[PDB]
Design an enzyme around this catalytic site. Structure first.
Site, PDB file in Angstrom:
ATOM      1  N   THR A 222       0.786  -1.287   0.000  1.00  0.00           N
ATOM      2  CA  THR A 222       0.000   0.000   0.000  1.00  0.00           C
ATOM      3  C   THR A 222       0.806   1.321   0.000  1.00  0.00           C
ATOM      4  O   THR A 222       1.952   1.364   0.450  1.00  0.00           O
ATOM      5  CB  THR A 222      -0.884   0.018   1.228  1.00  0.00           C
ATOM      6  OG1 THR A 222      -1.734  -1.083   1.080  1.00  0.00           O
ATOM      7  CG2 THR A 222      -1.784   1.248   1.353  1.00  0.00           C
TER       8      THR A 222
HETATM    9  C1  LIG Z   1       0.137  -2.563   0.539  1.00  0.00           C
HETATM   10  C2  LIG Z   1      -0.234  -3.523  -0.626  1.00  0.00           C
HETATM   11  C3  LIG Z   1       1.201  -3.340   1.349  1.00  0.00           C
HETATM   12  O1  LIG Z   1       1.405  -2.654   2.607  1.00  0.00           O
HETATM   13  C4  LIG Z   1      -1.141  -2.294   1.480  1.00  0.00           C
HETATM   14  O2  LIG Z   1      -0.717  -2.198   2.852  1.00  0.00           O
HETATM   15  C5  LIG Z   1      -2.303  -3.299   1.434  1.00  0.00           C
HETATM   16  C6  LIG Z   1      -3.357  -2.800   2.416  1.00  0.00           C
HETATM   17  C7  LIG Z   1      -4.791  -2.804   1.834  1.00  0.00           C
HETATM   18  C8  LIG Z   1      -5.133  -4.058   1.019  1.00  0.00           C
HETATM   19  C9  LIG Z   1      -5.778  -2.697   3.015  1.00  0.00           C
HETATM   20  N1  LIG Z   1      -1.938  -4.623   1.950  1.00  0.00           N
HETATM   21  C10 LIG Z   1      -2.223  -5.772   1.314  1.00  0.00           C
HETATM   22  O3  LIG Z   1      -2.722  -5.864   0.195  1.00  0.00           O
HETATM   23  C11 LIG Z   1      -1.876  -7.024   2.096  1.00  0.00           C
HETATM   24  C12 LIG Z   1      -0.382  -7.185   2.145  1.00  0.00           C
HETATM   25  C13 LIG Z   1      -0.137  -8.088   3.187  1.00  0.00           C
HETATM   26  C14 LIG Z   1       0.158  -9.421   2.897  1.00  0.00           C
HETATM   27  C15 LIG Z   1       0.398 -10.322   3.930  1.00  0.00           C
HETATM   28  C16 LIG Z   1       0.345  -9.894   5.255  1.00  0.00           C
HETATM   29  C17 LIG Z   1       0.050  -8.565   5.549  1.00  0.00           C
HETATM   30  C18 LIG Z   1      -0.187  -7.665   4.516  1.00  0.00           C
HETATM   31  N2  LIG Z   1      -2.485  -8.169   1.403  1.00  0.00           N
HETATM   32  C19 LIG Z   1      -3.385  -8.977   1.997  1.00  0.00           C
HETATM   33  O4  LIG Z   1      -3.803  -8.849   3.149  1.00  0.00           O
HETATM   34  C20 LIG Z   1      -3.915 -10.106   1.119  1.00  0.00           C
HETATM   35  C21 LIG Z   1      -5.307  -9.709   0.709  1.00  0.00           C
HETATM   36  C22 LIG Z   1      -6.055 -10.937   0.155  1.00  0.00           C
HETATM   37  C23 LIG Z   1      -5.441 -11.398  -1.178  1.00  0.00           C
HETATM   38  C24 LIG Z   1      -7.524 -10.551  -0.046  1.00  0.00           C
HETATM   39  N3  LIG Z   1      -3.871 -11.347   1.890  1.00  0.00           N
HETATM   40  C25 LIG Z   1      -2.838 -12.199   1.782  1.00  0.00           C
HETATM   41  O5  LIG Z   1      -1.844 -12.019   1.077  1.00  0.00           O
HETATM   42  C26 LIG Z   1      -2.929 -13.401   2.704  1.00  0.00           C
HETATM   43  C27 LIG Z   1      -2.792 -12.818   4.080  1.00  0.00           C
HETATM   44  C28 LIG Z   1      -2.581 -13.930   5.091  1.00  0.00           C
HETATM   45  C29 LIG Z   1      -2.023 -13.286   6.216  1.00  0.00           C
HETATM   46  C30 LIG Z   1      -0.711 -13.548   6.630  1.00  0.00           C
HETATM   47  C31 LIG Z   1      -0.184 -12.892   7.745  1.00  0.00           C
HETATM   48  C32 LIG Z   1      -0.956 -11.970   8.450  1.00  0.00           C
HETATM   49  C33 LIG Z   1      -2.261 -11.703   8.042  1.00  0.00           C
HETATM   50  C34 LIG Z   1      -2.789 -12.358   6.932  1.00  0.00           C
HETATM   51  N4  LIG Z   1      -1.815 -14.308   2.420  1.00  0.00           N
HETATM   52  C35 LIG Z   1      -1.941 -15.425   1.686  1.00  0.00           C
HETATM   53  O6  LIG Z   1      -2.987 -15.823   1.171  1.00  0.00           O
HETATM   54  C36 LIG Z   1      -0.639 -16.215   1.540  1.00  0.00           C
HETATM   55  N5  LIG Z   1      -0.242 -16.316   0.115  1.00  0.00           N
HETATM   56  C37 LIG Z   1      -0.547 -17.670  -0.417  1.00  0.00           C
HETATM   57  C38 LIG Z   1      -0.078 -17.725  -1.836  1.00  0.00           C
HETATM   58  O7  LIG Z   1       1.313 -17.510  -1.773  1.00  0.00           O
HETATM   59  C39 LIG Z   1       1.669 -16.152  -1.405  1.00  0.00           C
HETATM   60  C40 LIG Z   1       1.192 -15.956  -0.012  1.00  0.00           C
END
Ligand SMILES: *[C@@](C)(CO)[C@](*)(O)[C@H](CC(C)C)NC(=O)[C@H](Cc1ccccc1)NC(=O)[C@H](CC(C)C)NC(=O)[C@H](CCc1ccccc1)NC(=O)CN1CCOCC1
Ligand SMILES: *[C@@](C)(CO)[C@](*)(O)[C@H](CC(C)C)NC(=O)[C@H](Cc1ccccc1)NC(=O)[C@H](CC(C)C)NC(=O)[C@H](CCc1ccccc1)NC(=O)CN1CCOCC1
Ligand SMILES: *[C@@](C)(CO)[C@](*)(O)[C@H](CC(C)C)NC(=O)[C@H](Cc1ccccc1)NC(=O)[C@H](CC(C)C)NC(=O)[C@H](CCc1ccccc1)NC(=O)CN1CCOCC1
Ligand SMILES: [Cl-]
Ligand SMILES: [Mg+2]
Ligand SMILES: [Mg+2]
Lengths: 233, 204, 195, 125, 196, 212, 222, 222, 195
Positions: free
Chosen positions: E1
């Site tokens: 983000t």
């Molecule tokens: C920017 C992009 C990064 O800081 C922004 O902060 C955004 C915030 C918005 C969306 C509110 N963050 C994200 O997009 C966020 C980045 C992230 C990833 C992992 C942990 C924390 C932050 N993305 C997500 O939360 C996605 C959203 C889904 C696709 C709807 N979720 C994942 O990537 C999940 C999260 C699981 C998780 C892990 C640890 C703590 C909390 C949640 N991860 C997966 O599904 C794993 N994935 C499987 C496939 O192989 C890659 C990893």
């Protein structure tokens, strides 16, 4: 044992009736940092082959030097270096494929995925893939990285099997490649808008297009999207 | 230390023309050591048949649990439970232990007494229902059973022919698995008669 | 705790259990009786983790003896074995499971038949003509496959048992200091003093 | 390393270095071997121009290769020590791998093989 | 983000990109990271999408219940509720939230809440992976009591650079204007902001 | 695997199963686990299939080179020690081999040598090697006497493998029998457990645990 | 950390007749959940009426085939153009495979052809070189599905003569090239149905005294 | 799995493939991934098969009780909120990845839910192992103001991309159309482009082939 | 490989070594001689890692026998023990060390004295009146501290040795299948056949 540092993303390609098309964006990523923006990842060898490389850029630059040196070496004591005994796509590929496997076998791989696109001396289309493991395969459409997941599906709708190749023109084939590059810009977090495209035709020869941009994008619908469920404002 | 492959065993079920068949091996071992050659894996509650592969203690526990639940069902409902209903009961019971599951691969088989339709179904260890027209497989030689059934099976087999097909599917699959075999049992189930046959197979 | 065997013959069940109790590089005792009488016609031998074994055996013994007093009636070997299995089946999914394997030899007075049950620490029950726990089975099962007959007498069963102990004494790495043999039949439980 | 081919053929088909090595043997003190029905006897000459010798400590002409095989020789005394040492090591090496002492034919074949190797190896006589 | 909130003469403006990622795959390219917890109290979300949504939903519930009893809450009060959730559940949360709101008394206010759960009241705030690349730019270009048009340009240019360098940021630039006049939503597409 | 060989009045009996496994997958039921080194030498193989086969095939070449050089058949002791010294060089590298070198010579008489991949080399009268060795030992030891006839000895060896094939999940297929005399080894046929078990059950009256 | 191995999927099948032998294999090449090629052949004519396939990790498979093809070439040079017999080829391959005992070729290899009596032959190899001649062998991803079916249909296992009280076994007999190809096609369509790494196409190489013939058949592309 | 959702003029359409895997093995070749939460709120499910079934039934049950309590037709946002809060509570351990769609008094809606409890809004969405193959098609062909027939075509095309190009997806295409003012139509096996070809041979055995030891009549009656 | 003992008395050295060879849950042999004669008046028993033990023993034996032939002279037990120690001292810092512990019993013909040396796999040499390797020492040392006298005869030494074996057979967990006893004195090396 390596880890890749500065990296290049998808390389996509396909066959059409008279030749092959290959494309790759001009980005050199440093993890999540989009560090370098003027990187050419398509490298022509002679006037009949283009090697598209993804993965580690330092290893790509090494491979550039090898190919550059290969042309020099072939010209030595060779009166037919620009004719019958010129470098073929199949020669260039097999050389790289030999190196890639030798390096993996010494546990010190060139951290890349490579697609050698070209046209042979007899007019046949050449398109074959090789990677850090020395794994090789050929297909009417080939793509690396995210390209394999998103480009191939789209390109296979045009050329699904061998018999669809003569039916596909250069206009239709290029359109599919440019479309695929747009989709990758939408969905690949380590991609850029700017890219290069190369066409190797058995008639018109090598056409190398630089400084292309993804265009005709759909973003307008974003304004209507509010919140993540309930929210109305 | 993989619960599903300590004791070993297999179950297979097939449908035919107005009939179903369910079959299992007889082996119970402790890894390499064969311990018992009388350990049957198919049970029945009324006209509904349940086969269970996997960890033997859970096979026994679940049999006793479904006997328990089907007995109360019959007392309250004043009728025998049907295969479709029993299938749902198994799924409920397994998913209840979602984060501490029974290490089993159950298989329901039977004929609905009202409609007369042949019914078979399979489950994973947390209760996901796998319904099928043709066949269901389970156990340490599931890969082998999948290969045998997919090639040998054909629809609308007569009970006598269906017996041969399921028996050959089980036997040849068991002979390619170290932890399965040591005897086999085949239940042929018609609308209002059930024949149980013990097969002769290689004892190694 | 190591060697426990069981052989069901025509009219009785014979349980053999090793006498050695070892910790570290020391045999602390060579006269240990690895069994408890659950009821007048039911005997349970046991082997497994130190402490757990006796704690479990006596807990079962207490429960069966309580039942006998309450109903003024002896439970069948089948009923006892099912009770024991359920206890171990609960145990395995506890915070700290009982790591105990048992053999239950009994004589059913209603059926007039001897019965041998083999139950492991997971709660895996099987009725057998002959049984063993631990590494013992790797020798004794194949030996019994060959020499065992279903219509044997108690004396023939003891000779068959001697054959097992001899093989174990020959091929087992550890010295288990011989076995205590007990016979369960229509007249109850008795110990063979000279073996 | 010193590579020179010292043992080589001559026009008449002779290897002079090997033949001159025989002359050294001809110069050496006499040695005799006679085998009976149930025994073998090894006789050896010792030249009598050397008085004031210490016969206790002077290297004996007959050497034990193993407890059951002996080796006497004629020629250069210093050269004989190298062959005897190699033979003694091979005798122990044979017992180690074959679990049986060498035959007299085998031990001879080995010693003879060493002698041959020095007739077509570079840098050696 | 990439997210930011900036106070100015007439009130405060929130700004954000629209990218959601799963590793290097963009799960959503038109995400709305600017979310309403009250009429004129909004927040920018960064970190876990699941966590930030769960948190924002709870805060909205708390502020709705606050309004029913004690009337309109202050922007400081809203930030305090965000803090209480983020701080007390710091071991199980990955959420970087910027709280922004408009009072009539206090005008525009901005509170930032990092991973730890600490609160920091600031003239403007930047956060998210892509914020690292614009600390230099934002510090050099930010002025207090800017106009609406100046603040929109400041956020647009800032998030444009953040998007340009951060692979984890992209898509459209969403903005939300909070003033006495009301609530205005703005959007800016790649073709405009990329060539700034 | 299960393999055995024992020494007795009338020479040496050698018996093996024929199964090969890759985990719980039964890869083959027709593997030859007796390597015929020469007319007077046999080798049993248990453990890693490739290791055993490659190196005992190699052993036969080394034994051939011995008799060319020495004009005499290699001793059972020397043959076994070539193999044991080989595997000792590879000690730690992860070779998996459980072998028995069985044969007759004039000087030694009938001789059996146990050799394994961690360098152990043992002369002895009775040995059982493999995943089902304990099952074979149980039947073999309880019925073994030096004064067994050639007919009874052949059967006991066969019956011991059958016992192990039954109980051990990683043993089975068929029994391969061999008899080693002063005149050399004699092959005594391949015996499929599929038919042999029921034949033995009925005639002997054993295997009462199984449903007849 | 760098992992030098990969799984390219696919499955192969060898069946021997009386005066012929077949070596079949699907044409699908994969990595993880992606298809790399719908037609990438992995059954090769190596000369001297020997067909070969090394299924598993394609890079090692290609390396091995390439080396054996080269081994055949040098066998001709060194031994006066002598024909490499199938048994000799098998032993040679064992030494190729075991040569990398401590850094193996991750492949299941199968070769097929005719023995020196003119009869059909199929040999199969594990990754480190242990080999065995058989009438029948499946290898690769769907080997566990196909192999027991072959035991039943090629070697007539568990099949007894009707009405003989399970006392007389079904007598063994050689199969015709027509019957074998039916079993190959049914094996692969069945494997395609139940295994995700198997599909796209089927390529069969048939070996008779006349030479090496090819046959291709479509498989499901899902 | 491959699952998608596409909004159109007067409603929303969702679709799914019908493959169910167990490792590399296809367990069910025709399983139903479209779940009914309420009459006009349907749900496509990817991930852990038991979880998607269980979580959808639980919320569907509570939605029914809520609908009866409030005397109102249920809303998609209610199902969305109940699902995400449940999934969030279990911190991703319940592996359900859902596309929730439907029509209610507020209008037509389309959402997605992930296992960790995050929700997304869109005009077109795709989840599962073949979501990248599907999303490529959606990004290439989607436009604003789609008709009913255009949305079904686009949705089924996106599923087909998954069926062919993703090994985790296959077999048939299920579709459910939810239009405003009309009953939702569930089109089970809307497309069946993966029909098994006729087998080359019948494997019906001669009666008496299998050897038997014992026979007995089993008592099922009281 | 497990139990090796040694007792130096007035006029001889007595070595006792266990006969059992075990791998896994099987005693493969119960008549194993864990010793090699290095020279007519020097004997070395050994115990440790499988394969290493015999390979090392025979390598030492070969070297000492080579010396004897070369010089037509028997090395003293002190000289042999020092050679052995140096080999093990090299070994320990090798790529793959010999994991072998040894006892060297010998009779010095020049001094007319028996000598017992205990050397571990690290190359740690000590001359002792009585010695043991492995877990054996934990029982035998304290026993010998009590009963041993320096002026004992060979017959008294054998009775003292019987006392050790009895204690080990009583308290050791593993069955080591008895011992082979050998005596080293002025007349060379001989084996006690009945023990
Ligand atoms: C920017 C992009 C990064 O800081 C922004 O902060 C955004 C915030 C918005 C969306 C509110 N963050 C994200 O997009 C966020 C980045 C992230 C990833 C992992 C942990 C924390 C932050 N993305 C997500 O939360 C996605 C959203 C889904 C696709 C709807 N979720 C994942 O990537 C999940 C999260 C699981 C998780 C892990 C640890 C703590 C909390 C949640 N991860 C997966 O599904 C794993 N994935 C499987 C496939 O192989 C890659 C990893
Ligand atoms: C009894 C029958 C079982 O223990 C015997 O001991 C036999 C000995 C006979 C065959 C001589 N042992 C085996 O069958 C042996 C067990 C074993 C396995 C692995 C290591 C040591 C021992 N099995 C094998 O050697 C098989 C034989 C093949 C199947 C014909 N080979 C393998 O398992 C190979 C090679 C293993 C290996 C060893 C050392 C380095 C590298 C590899 N592995 C595979 O085939 C892997 N494979 C991939 C996916 O398909 C399943 C099998
Ligand atoms: C595509 C097809 C993904 O491949 C879709 O996403 C589908 C969703 C449909 C079915 C709704 N997903 C699956 O088919 C899913 C894939 C999967 C596998 C493992 C983990 C997560 C997702 N498959 C399943 O859920 C199957 C359903 C069977 C075929 C009925 N279940 C299994 O594979 C279970 C997994 C159970 C599990 C428990 C705890 C956490 C996660 C998963 N596995 C087994 O039963 C394997 N094993 C057999 C021996 O007994 C012990 C268990
Ligand atoms: Cl979000
Ligand atoms: Mg077996
Ligand atoms: Mg697919």
């Amino acid at each position: 044992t390596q880890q890749p540092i500065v990296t290049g993303t998808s390389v996509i390609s396909m066959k059409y009736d008279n030749g092959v098309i290959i494309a790759a964006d001009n980005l050199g990523s440093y993890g999540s940092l989009l560090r370098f923006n003027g990187v050419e990842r398509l490298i022509p060898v002679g006037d009949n082959t283009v090697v598209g490389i993804s993965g580690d850029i330092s290893d790509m630059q090494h491979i550039e030097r090898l190919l550059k040196d290969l042309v020099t070496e072939n010209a030595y004591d060779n009166p037919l270096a620009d004719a019958e005994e010129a470098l073929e796509p199949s020669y260039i590929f097999e050389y790289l494929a030999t190196v890639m496997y030798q390096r993996r076998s010494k546990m010190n791989p060139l951290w890349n995925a490579i697609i050698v696109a070209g046209v042979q001396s007899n007019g046949d289309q050449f398109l074959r893939y090789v990677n850090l493991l020395g794994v090789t395969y050929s297909s009417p459409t080939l793509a690396t990285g995210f390209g394999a997941h998103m480009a191939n599906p789209l390109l296979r709708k045009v050329v699904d099997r061998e018999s669809d190749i003569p039916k596909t023109t250069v206009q239709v084939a290029e359109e599919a490649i440019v479309n695929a590059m747009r989709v990758l810009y939408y969905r690949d977090a380590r991609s850029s808008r700017n890219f290069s495209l190369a066409i190797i035709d058995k008639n018109t020869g090598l056409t190398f297009k630089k400084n292309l941009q993804v265009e005709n994008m759909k973003w307008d619908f974003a304004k209507d999207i509010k919140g993540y469920g309930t929210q109305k404002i | 230390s993989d619960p599903s492959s300590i004791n070993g065993g297999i179950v297979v079920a097939m449908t035919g023309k107005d009939c179903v068949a369910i079959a299992c091996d007889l082996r119970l071992g402790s890894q390499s050591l064969g311990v018992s050659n009388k350990f049957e894996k198919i049970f029945h509650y009324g006209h509904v048949f349940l086969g269970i592969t996997g960890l033997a203690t859970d096979v026994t526990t679940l049999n006793e649990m479904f006997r328990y639940k089907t007995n109360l069902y019959k007392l309250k409902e004043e009728r025998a439970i049907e295969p479709e209903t029993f299938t749902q009961l198994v799924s409920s019971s397994l998913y209840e232990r979602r984060f501490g599951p029974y290490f089993v691969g159950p298989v329901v088989a039977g004929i609905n007494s009202k409609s007369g339709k042949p019914f078979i179904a399979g489950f994973d260890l947390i209760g996901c229902i796998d319904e099928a027209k043709d066949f269901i497989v389970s156990g340490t030689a599931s890969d082998q059973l999948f290969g045998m059934c997919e090639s040998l099976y054909e629809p609308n087999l007569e009970p006598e022919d269906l017996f041969e097909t399921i028996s050959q599917a089980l036997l040849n699959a068991a002979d390619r698995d170290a932890l399965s075999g040591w005897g086999a049992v085949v239940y042929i189930i018609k609308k209002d008669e059930v024949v149980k046959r013990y097969l002769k197979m290689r004892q190694d | 705790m190591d060697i426990i065997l069981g052989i069901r013959v025509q009219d009785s069940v014979i349980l053999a259990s090793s006498k050695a109790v070892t910790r570290g590089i020391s045999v602390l005792k060579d006269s240990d009786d690895k069994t408890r009488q659950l009821s007048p016609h039911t005997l349970m031998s046991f082997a497994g983790e130190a402490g757990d074994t006796v704690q479990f055996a006596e807990y079962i013994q207490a429960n069966i003896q309580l039942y006998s007093i309450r109903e003024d009636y002896e439970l069948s070997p089948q009923a006892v074995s099912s009770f024991v299995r359920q206890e171990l089946a609960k145990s395995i999914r506890s915070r700290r499971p009982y790591q105990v394997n048992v053999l239950i030899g009994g004589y059913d007075k209603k059926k007039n038949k001897p019965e041998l049950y083999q139950i492991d620490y997971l709660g895996t029950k099987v009725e057998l003509p002959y049984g063993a726990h631990g590494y013992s089975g790797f020798y004794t099962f194949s030996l019994l496959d060959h020499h065992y007959r279903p219509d044997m007498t108690t004396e023939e069963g003891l000779d068959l048992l001697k054959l097992c102990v001899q093989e174990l004494e020959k091929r087992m790495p550890m010295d288990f200091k011989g076995v205590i043999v007990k016979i369960v039949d229509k007249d109850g439980i008795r110990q063979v003093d000279d073996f | 390393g010193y590579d020179r081919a010292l043992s080589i053929f001559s026009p008449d088909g002779h290897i002079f270095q090997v033949e001159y090595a025989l002359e050294a043997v001809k110069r050496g003190t006499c040695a005799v071997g006679v085998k009976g029905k149930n025994c073998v006897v090894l006789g050896c000459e010792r030249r009598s121009t050397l008085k004031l010798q210490d016969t206790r400590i002077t290297p004996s002409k007959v050497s034990k290769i193993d407890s059951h095989v002996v080796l006497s020789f004629s020629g250069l005394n210093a050269d004989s020590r190298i062959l005897i040492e190699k033979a003694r090591v091979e005798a122990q090496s044979h017992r180690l791998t074959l679990e049986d002492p060498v035959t007299v034919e085998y031990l001879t074949r080995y010693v003879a093989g060493v002698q041959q190797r020095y007739t077509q190896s570079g840098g050696v006589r | 983000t990439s997210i930011m909130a900036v106070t100015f003469k007439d009130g405060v403006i929130l700004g954000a990109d629209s990218r959601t990622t799963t590793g290097a795959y963009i799960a959503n390219r038109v995400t709305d990271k600017l979310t309403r917890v009250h009429d004129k109290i909004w927040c920018c979300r960064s970190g876990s999408a699941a966590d930030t949504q769960a948190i924002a939903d709870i805060v909205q519930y708390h502020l709705e219940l606050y309004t029913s009893q004690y009337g309109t809450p202050s922007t400081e009060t809203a930030a305090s509720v965000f803090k209480e959730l983020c701080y007390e559940n710091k071991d199980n949360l990955t959420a970087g939230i910027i709280v922004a709101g408009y009072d009539d008394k206090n005008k525009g206010e901005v509170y930032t809440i990092p991973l730890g759960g600490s609160v920091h009241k600031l003239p403007y705030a930047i956060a998210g992976s892509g914020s690292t690349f614009i600390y230099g730019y934002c510090d050099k270009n930010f002025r207090e009591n800017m106009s609406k048009e100046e603040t929109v340009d400041f956020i647009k240019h800032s998030l444009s650079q953040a998007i340009k360098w951060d692979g984890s940021s992209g898509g459209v630039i969403r903005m939300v204007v909070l003033t006495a006049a009301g609530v205005e939503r703005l959007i800016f597409y790649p073709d405009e902001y990329e060539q700034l | 695997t299960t393999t055995l060989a024992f020494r007795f009045q009338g020479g040496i009996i050698v018996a093996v199963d024929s199964r090969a496994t890759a985990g719980n997958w039964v890869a083959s039921q027709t593997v030859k686990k007796v390597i015929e080194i020469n007319p007077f030498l046999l080798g049993t193989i248990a453990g890693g299939a490739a290791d055993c086969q490659f190196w005992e095939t190699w052993l036969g070449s080394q034994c051939r080179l011995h008799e060319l050089r020495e004009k005499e058949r290699i001793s059972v002791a020397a043959a076994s020690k070539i193999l044991s010294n080989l595997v000792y060089q590879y000690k730690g590298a992860g070779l998996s081999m459980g072998t028995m070198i069985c044969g007759y010579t004039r000087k030694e008489g009938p001789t059996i040598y146990y050799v394994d991949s961690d360098g152990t080399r043992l002369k002895g009268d009775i040995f059982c090697v493999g995943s089902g060795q304990t099952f074979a030992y149980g039947v073999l030891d309880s019925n073994y006497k030096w004064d067994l006839s050639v007919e009874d000895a052949l059967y006991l060896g066969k019956r011991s493998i059958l016992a192990a094939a039954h109980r051990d999940a990683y043993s089975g297929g068929s029994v391969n029998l061999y008899h080693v005399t002063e005149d050399g080894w004699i092959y005594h046929g391949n015996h499929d457990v599929g038919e042999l078990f029921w034949k033995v059950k009925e005639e002997e009256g054993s295997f009462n645990n199984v449903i007849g | 950390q760098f992992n030098p191995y990969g799984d390219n999927g696919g499955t192969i099948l060898g069946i021997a007749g009386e005066d012929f032998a077949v070596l079949a294999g699907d044409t699908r090449n994969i990595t993880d959940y992606s298809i790399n090629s719908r037609y990438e052949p992995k059954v090769f004519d190596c000369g001297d009426n020997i067909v070969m396939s090394a299924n598993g990790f394609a890079a090692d498979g290609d390396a091995l085939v390439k080396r054996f093809k080269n081994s055949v070439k040098w066998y001709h040079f060194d031994h006066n153009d002598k024909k490499l017999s199938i048994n000799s080829a098998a032993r040679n391959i064992q030494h190729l495979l075991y040569g990398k005992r401590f850094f193996p070729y991750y492949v299941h290899t199968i070769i097929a052809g005719l023995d020196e009596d003119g009869k059909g032959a199929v040999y199969s190899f594990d990754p480190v070189g242990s080999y065995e001649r058989e009438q029948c062998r499946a290898g690769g991803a769907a080997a566990s599905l196909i192999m027991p079916f072959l035991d039943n249909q090629v070697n007539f296992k568990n099949q007894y003569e009707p009405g003989t009280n399970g006392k007389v076994k079904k007598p063994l007999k050689y199969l015709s090239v027509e019957e074998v190809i039916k079993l190959v096609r049914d094996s692969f369509t069945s494997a395609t149905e139940r295994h995700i790494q198997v599909g796209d196409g089927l390529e069969i190489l048939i070996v008779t005294k006349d030479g090496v013939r090819k046959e291709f058949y479509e498989l499901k592309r899902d | 799995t491959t699952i998608v959702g596409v909004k159109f003029n007067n409603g929303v359409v969702i679709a799914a493939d019908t493959r169910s895997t167990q490792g590399p093995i296809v367990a069910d070749k025709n399983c139903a991934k479209l779940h009914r939460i309420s009459p006009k709120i349907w749900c496509a499910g990817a991930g852990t098969a038991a979880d998607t079934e269980a979580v959808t039934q639980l919320i569907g049950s509570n939605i029914e009780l809520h609908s009866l309590y409030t005397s109102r037709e249920p809303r998609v946002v209610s199902a969305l909120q109940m699902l995400k809060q449940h999934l969030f509570k279990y911190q991703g351990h319940i592996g359900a990845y859902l596309i929730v769609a439907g029509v209610d008094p507020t209008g037509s809606h389309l959402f997605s839910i992930h296992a960790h409890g995050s929700t997304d809004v869109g005009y077109y969405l795709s989840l599962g192992s073949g979501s990248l193959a599907a999303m490529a098609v959606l990004e290439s062909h989607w436009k604003q103001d789609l008709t009913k027939e255009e949305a079904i075509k686009l949705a089924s095309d996106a599923i087909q991309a998954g069926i062919w190009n993703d090994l985790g997806s296959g077999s048939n295409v299920d579709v459910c159309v939810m239009e405003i003012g009309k009953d939702a139509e569930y089109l089970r096996n809307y497309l069946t482009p993966n029909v098994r070809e006729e087998k080359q041979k019948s494997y019906k055995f001669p009666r008496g082939t299998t050897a038997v030891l014992k026979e007995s009549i089993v008592n099922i009656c009281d």
